[PDB]
Motif scaffolding. Structure first.
Motif, PDB file in Angstrom:
ATOM      1  N   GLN A 113       1.776  -2.192  -9.025  1.00 39.28           N
ATOM      2  CA  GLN A 113       3.181  -2.363  -9.312  1.00 39.28           C
ATOM      3  C   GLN A 113       3.516  -1.637 -10.603  1.00 39.28           C
ATOM      4  O   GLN A 113       2.751  -1.710 -11.568  1.00 39.28           O
ATOM      5  N   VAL A 114       4.640  -0.925 -10.616  1.00 38.05           N
ATOM      6  CA  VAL A 114       5.050  -0.110 -11.751  1.00 38.05           C
ATOM      7  C   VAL A 114       6.399  -0.620 -12.223  1.00 38.05           C
ATOM      8  O   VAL A 114       7.358  -0.640 -11.444  1.00 38.05           O
ATOM      9  N   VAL A 115       6.479  -1.015 -13.496  1.00 33.67           N
ATOM     10  CA  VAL A 115       7.703  -1.550 -14.087  1.00 33.67           C
ATOM     11  C   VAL A 115       8.293  -0.499 -15.004  1.00 33.67           C
ATOM     12  O   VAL A 115       7.652  -0.070 -15.979  1.00 33.67           O
ATOM     13  N   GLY A 152       1.469   9.163  -3.453  1.00 31.80           N
ATOM     14  CA  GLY A 152       1.538   7.929  -2.688  1.00 31.80           C
ATOM     15  C   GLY A 152       2.945   7.527  -2.285  1.00 31.80           C
ATOM     16  O   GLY A 152       3.854   8.359  -2.311  1.00 31.80           O
ATOM     17  N   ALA A 153       3.133   6.256  -1.912  1.00 29.85           N
ATOM     18  CA  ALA A 153       4.402   5.747  -1.397  1.00 29.85           C
ATOM     19  C   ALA A 153       5.019   4.735  -2.354  1.00 29.85           C
ATOM     20  O   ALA A 153       4.368   3.767  -2.750  1.00 29.85           O
ATOM     21  N   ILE A 154       6.288   4.941  -2.701  1.00 27.77           N
ATOM     22  CA  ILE A 154       6.975   4.129  -3.697  1.00 27.77           C
ATOM     23  C   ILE A 154       7.963   3.211  -2.999  1.00 27.77           C
ATOM     24  O   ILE A 154       8.911   3.684  -2.367  1.00 27.77           O
ATOM     25  N   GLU A 155       7.771   1.905  -3.158  1.00 24.84           N
ATOM     26  CA  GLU A 155       8.629   0.887  -2.565  1.00 24.84           C
ATOM     27  C   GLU A 155       9.521   0.265  -3.642  1.00 24.84           C
ATOM     28  O   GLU A 155       9.047  -0.092  -4.724  1.00 24.84           O
ATOM     29  N   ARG A 172      11.275  -2.747 -10.636  1.00 25.86           N
ATOM     30  CA  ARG A 172       9.863  -2.849 -10.283  1.00 25.86           C
ATOM     31  C   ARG A 172       9.600  -1.968  -9.074  1.00 25.86           C
ATOM     32  O   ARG A 172      10.255  -2.127  -8.043  1.00 25.86           O
ATOM     33  N   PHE A 173       8.662  -1.036  -9.210  1.00 25.22           N
ATOM     34  CA  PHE A 173       8.194  -0.223  -8.100  1.00 25.22           C
ATOM     35  C   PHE A 173       6.851  -0.747  -7.604  1.00 25.22           C
ATOM     36  O   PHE A 173       6.003  -1.193  -8.385  1.00 25.22           O
TER      37      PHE A 173
END
Lengths: 17, 83
Positions: free
Chosen positions: A3-5, B33-36, A11-12
């Motif tokens: 997870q990327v903030v 990759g894939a970004i959600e 939040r991604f």
């Protein structure tokens, strides 16, 4: 799978697909 | 033309949902990759999200309009299929 903030809050979820 | 940035639904489109979950990835660049992420149709902008993905280390700073449109096409495509 991670997870990327962004500093503004959005939040991604990064996945391989 | 083509953008090469695929944006698709993440969850079944139920209608009357102001927020939708989307999935973005690249197949032709003309983390790998894939970004959600979630998108508010009445409030958030495809250019806003695109910047955030810029300020998050996915694409280059001046590659914002391109990713913004690839999200905007999917948001269009989901509202046209929403009649």
């Amino acid at each position: 799978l991670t997870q990327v903030v962004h500093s503004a809050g959005r939040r991604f979820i990064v996945s391989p697909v | 033309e083509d953008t090469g940035v695929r944006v698709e639904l993440a969850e079944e489109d139920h209608g009357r949902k102001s927020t939708i979950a989307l999935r973005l990835w690249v197949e032709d660049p003309k983390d790998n990759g894939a970004i959600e992420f979630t998108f508010d149709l009445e409030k958030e902008t495809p250019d806003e999200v695109a910047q955030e993905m810029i300020e998050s280390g996915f694409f280059h700073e001046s590659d914002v309009k391109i990713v913004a449109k690839s999200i905007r096409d999917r948001v269009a495509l989901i509202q046209w299929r929403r009649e």
